[PDB]
Amino acid sequence: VIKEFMRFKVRMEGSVNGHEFEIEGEGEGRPYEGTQTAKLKVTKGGPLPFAWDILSPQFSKAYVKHPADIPDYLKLSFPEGFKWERVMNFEDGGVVTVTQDSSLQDGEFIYKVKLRGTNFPSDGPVMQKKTMGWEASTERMYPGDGDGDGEAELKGEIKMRLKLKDGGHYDAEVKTTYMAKKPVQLPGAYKTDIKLDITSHNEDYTIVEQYERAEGRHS
Numbered sequence: 044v045i046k047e048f049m050r051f052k053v054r055m056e057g058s059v060n061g062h063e064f065e066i067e068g069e070g071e072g073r074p075y076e077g078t079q080t081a082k083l084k085v086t087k088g089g090p091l092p093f094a095w096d097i098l099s100p101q102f103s104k105a106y107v108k109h110p111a112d113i114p115d116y117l118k119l120s121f122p123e124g125f126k127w128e129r130v131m132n133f134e135d136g137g138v139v140t141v142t143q144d145s146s147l148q149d150g151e152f153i154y155k156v157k158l159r160g161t162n163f164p165s166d167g168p169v170m171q172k173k174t175m176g177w178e179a180s181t182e183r184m185y186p187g188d189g190d191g192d193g194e195a196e197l198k199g200e201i202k203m204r205l206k207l208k209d210g211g212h213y214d215a216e217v218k219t220t221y222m223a224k225k226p227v228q229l230p231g232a233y234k235t236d237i238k239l240d241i242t243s244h245n246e247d248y249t250i251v252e253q254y255e256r257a258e259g260r261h262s
């Protein structure tokens with residue numbers, strides 16, 4: 044059901060420091076090559092009064108290139124799909140919590156995202172729009188119980204670093220649990236190398252295009 048070229052549609056509803064917004068977008072990519080693009084539009088609550096960069100990692104793990112000897116748990120979960128739940132703890136106390144549902148309908152992936160950002164300092168780089176994209180990251184994957192049923196799901200941990208417009212960096216610690224909707228084979232521990240670029244945007248980041256390349260490899 045996962046072809047060599049796949050499209051997706053995404054909707055996000057969120058709030059950051061109480062500012063509510065909605066985003067609708069579409070994407071496409073090559074799931075076995077690990078590459079994908081997305082075009083997002085802010086349909087309500089724009090222009091966003093905070094940095095786009097805290098949203099960009101929430102817009103697609105079916106598109107991670109995996110070697111044949113690492114089970115591709117998230118690809119195997121389809122057509123039913125999977126859910127994920129993420130916490131990002133930023134170094135100045137801001138927090139982003141995300142929940143997401145991924146399914147396959149009419150030959151396309153369907154993503155539904157709910158996001159809540161809290162406690163960003165009013166004078167910090169997120170609320171002041173002083174960020175300039177993510178450095179490449181490495182997510183460390185491992186099987187572990189993330190939902191209290193006693194059975195392992197797939198967990199990931201990332202140390203992420205955002206570049207600052209005025210010079211410097213700004214760090215976040217991220218934990219995600221990925222949960223298949225049907226029983227499928229979990230891998231052992233491995234790592235995923237990820238690089239996400241904003242490839243174009245209008246001046247106020249209400250229409251934004253992203254590109255991501257992601258590849259799983261042995262530890």
Ligand SMILES: [Ca+2]
Pocket residue numbers: 187188189190191192193194195196
């Ligand atoms: Ca579990």
Ligand SMILES: [Ca+2]
Pocket residue numbers: 190192194196222
């Ligand atoms: Ca479970």
